[PDB]
């Protein structure tokens, strides 16, 4: 399934998605898209649109 990532950093927001056959996999894809923009902050999940929200 597609799986999406909201970025919400205090200045560089962004937007990914990834196929992914589990969701804590593209939670962990995900961690490593925020991390890797530098990007840390409190994690939520939604789970009727498949979509984590990082939000510093």
Known sequence: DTYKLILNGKTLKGETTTEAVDAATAEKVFKXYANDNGVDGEW?????????????
Request: aromatic share 16%; no cysteine; charged share 30%.
């Open 44 to 56: 939520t999940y939604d789970d009727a649109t498949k979509t984590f929200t990082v939000t510093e």
